[PDB]
Design an enzyme around this catalytic site. Structure first.
Site, PDB file in Angstrom:
ATOM      1  N   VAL A 180      46.692 -14.827 -63.795  1.00  0.00           N
ATOM      2  CA  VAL A 180      48.170 -14.796 -63.935  1.00  0.00           C
ATOM      3  C   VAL A 180      48.561 -13.465 -64.593  1.00  0.00           C
ATOM      4  O   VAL A 180      49.556 -12.864 -64.155  1.00  0.00           O
ATOM      5  CB  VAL A 180      48.674 -16.033 -64.700  1.00  0.00           C
ATOM      6  CG1 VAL A 180      49.985 -15.764 -65.423  1.00  0.00           C
ATOM      7  CG2 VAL A 180      48.819 -17.233 -63.771  1.00  0.00           C
ATOM      8  N   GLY A 181      47.803 -12.997 -65.584  1.00  0.00           N
ATOM      9  CA  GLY A 181      48.135 -11.748 -66.301  1.00  0.00           C
ATOM     10  C   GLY A 181      47.103 -11.372 -67.345  1.00  0.00           C
ATOM     11  O   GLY A 181      46.070 -12.052 -67.450  1.00  0.00           O
ATOM     12  N   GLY A 235      47.591  -9.141 -71.335  1.00  0.00           N
ATOM     13  CA  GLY A 235      47.917  -8.173 -72.404  1.00  0.00           C
ATOM     14  C   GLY A 235      46.651  -7.514 -72.937  1.00  0.00           C
ATOM     15  O   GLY A 235      45.606  -7.635 -72.273  1.00  0.00           O
ATOM     16  N   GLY A 271      44.210 -10.432 -74.647  1.00  0.00           N
ATOM     17  CA  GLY A 271      43.389 -11.305 -73.772  1.00  0.00           C
ATOM     18  C   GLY A 271      43.850 -11.364 -72.320  1.00  0.00           C
ATOM     19  O   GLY A 271      44.827 -10.667 -71.957  1.00  0.00           O
ATOM     20  N   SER A 272      43.142 -12.177 -71.523  1.00  0.00           N
ATOM     21  CA  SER A 272      43.351 -12.425 -70.070  1.00  0.00           C
ATOM     22  C   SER A 272      43.802 -13.880 -69.902  1.00  0.00           C
ATOM     23  O   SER A 272      43.292 -14.705 -70.674  1.00  0.00           O
ATOM     24  CB  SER A 272      42.084 -12.164 -69.297  1.00  0.00           C
ATOM     25  OG  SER A 272      41.821 -10.773 -69.190  1.00  0.00           O
ATOM     26  N   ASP A 331      54.910 -17.759 -78.042  1.00  0.00           N
ATOM     27  CA  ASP A 331      54.574 -16.328 -78.339  1.00  0.00           C
ATOM     28  C   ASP A 331      55.116 -15.887 -79.713  1.00  0.00           C
ATOM     29  O   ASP A 331      55.882 -14.883 -79.805  1.00  0.00           O
ATOM     30  CB  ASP A 331      55.068 -15.386 -77.230  1.00  0.00           C
ATOM     31  CG  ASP A 331      54.178 -15.299 -76.001  1.00  0.00           C
ATOM     32  OD1 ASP A 331      53.190 -16.057 -75.912  1.00  0.00           O
ATOM     33  OD2 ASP A 331      54.504 -14.488 -75.120  1.00  0.00           O
TER      34      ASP A 331
HETATM   35 MG   LIG Z   1      56.064 -13.040 -74.534  1.00  0.00          MG
END
Ligand SMILES: [Mg+2]
Ligand SMILES: CN1C(=O)C[C@H](C(C)(C)C)N1O
Ligand SMILES: [Cl-]
Ligand SMILES: [Cl-]
Ligand SMILES: [Cl-]
Ligand SMILES: [Cl-]
Ligand SMILES: [Cl-]
Length: 345
Positions: free
Chosen positions: A26-27, A29, A32-33, A161
């Site tokens: 999905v993505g 940062g 992490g993955s 988050d």
């Molecule tokens: Mg966020």
């Protein structure tokens, strides 16, 4: 111990329990993955996050411990919860990898905004219900913005988050949504801040839901401060005294004085109760802002407010935040919290 299986998903070995099937990227940062998956034990579609470099430094090891402590505590309908946490390690000696499992969420508030008065009441009520809970534990979110607020299939809003004290000088520079929702005292380091910074962010989000436009889309820190003071007015002698930064104080006094604007002439055609609540959230002096608990009792939320169904948190011990430990001590504390995890009912 469950059985684990291995696969390579974009340059990365993933080792996960057999319950988790159909993993797809999905993505990622720099922390992490993330993969989407189907949890066969619960029937939930889930986000599985593999932390990157969780123990690489004292700062990183403490950040890992902070994030797991926070996610394990949060048990509220309007806050992201921890469904699972696992490691393939069989002992502290071979512990290197941490995986976190949460509910796959639907559209965020950017996707929703990009709405009736009734919809605005419903969505801001849920953010404030979840913030009354977070604040009751003496936790500050520090990063509320539309991309950190999402709704599931039943239109139940969740706060995600949490600010783990992670934002870089570069990430806050220029014409960026990463800064548009921040209280001026945190944006310019005026003073020791507290939980009032999250109510400023709620005011900015509520304004954008009402108009469909960013309230303070500054091109840099100074342009955004000028947009703010044009709406709420320049500070009086009482707030200037509370700016402990001498050079921040000196700069503010260079600006020509401006009065607070008429919010009924800015938010044209909005519910007068919505205008009244915005004037109580968007106050420059953070001591004078409305709190989450006070806002829930405002007449704007008459249709939704139920003071017997607005719960507070269990006490949250954050004494670790002022503790000085070695990498292997933070890593042992993290291992203990992984193995003691008990899943939700
Ligand atoms: Mg966020
Ligand atoms: C499921 N759901 C959404 O995604 C937003 C929508 C509105 C309250 C904005 C109508 N809600 O029902
Ligand atoms: Cl399993
Ligand atoms: Cl959840
Ligand atoms: Cl491991
Ligand atoms: Cl955003
Ligand atoms: Cl605790």
């Amino acid at each position: 111990r469950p059985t684990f299986y291995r696969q390579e998903l974009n340059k990365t070995i993933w080792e996960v329990p057999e319950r988790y099937q159909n993993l797809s990227p999905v993505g990622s940062g720099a922390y992490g993955s993330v993969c989407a998956a189907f949890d066969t034990k619960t029937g939930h579609r889930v986000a599985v996050k593999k932390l990157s470099r969780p123990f690489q430094s004292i700062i990183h090891a403490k950040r890992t411990y902070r994030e797991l402590r926070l996610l394990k505590h949060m048990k509220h309908e309007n806050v992201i919860g921890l469904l699972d946490v696992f490691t393939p390690a069989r002992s502290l000696e071979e512990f290197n990898d941490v995986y976190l499992v949460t509910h796959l969420m639907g559209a965020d508030l950017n996707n929703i905004v990009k709405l009736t008065d009734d919809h605005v009441q419903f969505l801001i009520y849920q953010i404030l219900r979840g913030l009354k809970y977070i604040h009751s534990a003496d936790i500050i979110h520090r990063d509320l913005k539309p991309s950190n607020l999402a709704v599931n299939e039943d239109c139940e809003l969740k706060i995600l988050d949490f600010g783990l004290a992670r934002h870089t000088d570069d990430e806050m520079t220029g014409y960026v949504a990463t800064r548009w929702y921040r209280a001026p005292e945190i944006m310019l380091n005026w003073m020791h801040y507290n939980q009032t910074v999250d109510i400023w962010s709620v005011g900015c989000i509520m304004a954008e839901l009402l108009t469909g436009r960013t309230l303070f889309p500054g091109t840099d820190h100074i342009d955004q401060l000028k947009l703010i003071l044009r709406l709420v007015g320049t500070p009086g002698a009482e707030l200037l005294k509370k700016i402990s930064s001498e050079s921040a104080r000196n700069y503010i006094q260079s600006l020509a004085q401006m009065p607070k604007m008429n919010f009924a002439n800015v938010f044209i055609g909005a519910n007068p109760l919505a205008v009244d609540l915005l004037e109580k959230m968007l106050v420059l002096d953070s001591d004078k802002r409305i709190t989450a608990a006070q806002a829930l009792a405002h007449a704007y939320f008459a249709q939704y407010h139920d003071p017997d169904d607005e719960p507070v948190a269990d006490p949250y011990d954050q004494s670790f935040e002022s503790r000085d430990l070695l990498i292997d001590e933070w890593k042992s504390l993290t291992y203990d919290e992984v193995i003691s995890f008990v899943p939700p009912p």
